[PDB]
Write an enzyme that holds these catalytic residues in place. Structure first.
Site, PDB file in Angstrom:
ATOM      1  N   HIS A 121      -6.214  -1.063  11.486  1.00 45.85           N
ATOM      2  CA  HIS A 121      -5.569  -1.496  10.245  1.00 45.85           C
ATOM      3  C   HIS A 121      -6.284  -2.700   9.634  1.00 45.85           C
ATOM      4  O   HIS A 121      -6.561  -3.673  10.336  1.00 45.85           O
ATOM      5  CB  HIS A 121      -4.093  -1.826  10.516  1.00 45.85           C
ATOM      6  CG  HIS A 121      -3.343  -2.291   9.308  1.00 45.85           C
ATOM      7  ND1 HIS A 121      -2.911  -1.433   8.323  1.00 45.85           N
ATOM      8  CD2 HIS A 121      -2.945  -3.530   8.929  1.00 45.85           C
ATOM      9  CE1 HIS A 121      -2.283  -2.120   7.387  1.00 45.85           C
ATOM     10  NE2 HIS A 121      -2.294  -3.396   7.728  1.00 45.85           N
ATOM     11  N   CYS A 133      -5.366   0.649   3.197  1.00 49.68           N
ATOM     12  CA  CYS A 133      -5.504  -0.740   3.734  1.00 49.68           C
ATOM     13  C   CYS A 133      -6.898  -1.309   3.541  1.00 49.68           C
ATOM     14  O   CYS A 133      -6.983  -2.432   3.157  1.00 49.68           O
ATOM     15  CB  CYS A 133      -5.032  -1.036   5.147  1.00 49.68           C
ATOM     16  SG  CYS A 133      -5.517   0.060   6.406  1.00 49.68           S
ATOM     17  N   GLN A 159       0.806  -1.224   0.000  1.00 52.75           N
ATOM     18  CA  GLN A 159       0.000   0.000   0.000  1.00 52.75           C
ATOM     19  C   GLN A 159       0.845   1.283   0.000  1.00 52.75           C
ATOM     20  O   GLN A 159       0.346   2.361  -0.336  1.00 52.75           O
ATOM     21  CB  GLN A 159      -0.985   0.001   1.176  1.00 52.75           C
ATOM     22  CG  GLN A 159      -0.357   0.248   2.545  1.00 52.75           C
ATOM     23  CD  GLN A 159      -1.338   0.048   3.672  1.00 52.75           C
ATOM     24  OE1 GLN A 159      -1.634  -1.084   4.059  1.00 52.75           O
ATOM     25  NE2 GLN A 159      -1.861   1.149   4.208  1.00 52.75           N
ATOM     26  N   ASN A 207      -1.307  -9.298   4.684  1.00 49.57           N
ATOM     27  CA  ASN A 207      -1.137  -7.864   4.878  1.00 49.57           C
ATOM     28  C   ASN A 207      -0.779  -7.187   3.552  1.00 49.57           C
ATOM     29  O   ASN A 207      -0.453  -7.864   2.563  1.00 49.57           O
ATOM     30  CB  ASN A 207      -0.066  -7.599   5.941  1.00 49.57           C
ATOM     31  CG  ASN A 207      -0.307  -6.316   6.733  1.00 49.57           C
ATOM     32  OD1 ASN A 207      -1.124  -5.464   6.363  1.00 49.57           O
ATOM     33  ND2 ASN A 207       0.410  -6.180   7.841  1.00 49.57           N
TER      34      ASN A 207
END
Length: 220
Positions: free
Chosen positions: A162, A25, A19, A182
């Site tokens: 997050h 996110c 990102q 992630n």
């Protein structure tokens, strides 16, 4: 339910993305979930556009690089009647004006989305057993930030600051885990992924069970 699930093993997970310097996110989590159900439903893996969500999916609460919500992500894809590909609408880690031409190109569609009942790791496991699931968790802490390997058992708070994507689960040495994708690139965690403790109860580890959702496609 299966004892082990890994959507990477059946080609339902696109290679790890980054990102960059943008709090997008929510968009990466939205896209990873949609990419997953699309392969599971249709049989084809296609990398999809986070930038489109950033540029074209702004709401009162979803604000490009200044954070947002996967449910708003899913809402956009439903409302727009689909999402363009990563290749066609590339990621720049910056907010830009919505490109109407590229918004009009729809390669992947979803039918609906559902929220996992809050604070319910069993309902979450049920969902993950069928497809990747968007979640938010507490990722601000030193130990989470510096995670490199193993099963993460904390310490961490429970603020949902997050967004990530659960792409499976399993158990090792009696310790249950979620597999989390992630969007911090391959240099964080286990080449971009984390195993995080599962079946701890309540809001789940780092609040992972607080705000889970997934896109729905009716047919397999």
């Amino acid at each position: 339910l299966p004892d082990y699930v890994d959507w990477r093993s059946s080609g339902a997970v696109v290679d790890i993305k980054d990102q960059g310097q943008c709090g997008s996110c929510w968009a990466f989590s939205t896209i990873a979930a949609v990419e997953g159900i699309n392969k599971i439903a249709t049989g084809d893996l296609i990398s999809l556009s986070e930038q489109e969500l950033v540029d074209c999916g702004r709401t009162q609460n979803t604000r490009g690089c200044d954070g947002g919500f996967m449910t708003d992500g899913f809402q956009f894809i439903i409302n727009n009647g689909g999402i363009n590909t990563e290749a066609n609408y590339p990621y720049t880690a910056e907010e830009g004006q919505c490109n109407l031409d590229l918004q009009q190109e729809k390669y992947v569609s979803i039918d609906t989305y559902e929220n996992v009942p809050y604070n319910n790791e069993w309902a979450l496991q049920t969902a993950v057993a069928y497809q990747p699931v968007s979640v938010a968790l507490e990722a601000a802490g030193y130990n989470f930030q510096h995670y490199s390997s193993g099963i993460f058992t904390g310490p961490c708070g429970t603020a949902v600051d997050h967004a990530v994507t659960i792409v499976g689960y399993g158990t090792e040495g009696g310790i249950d885990y979620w597999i989390v994708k992630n969007s911090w690139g391959t240099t964080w965690g286990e080449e971009g992924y984390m195993r995080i403790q599962r079946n701890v109860g309540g809001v789940g580890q780092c609040g992972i069970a607080k705000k889970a959702s997934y896109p729905v496609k009716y047919y397999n």
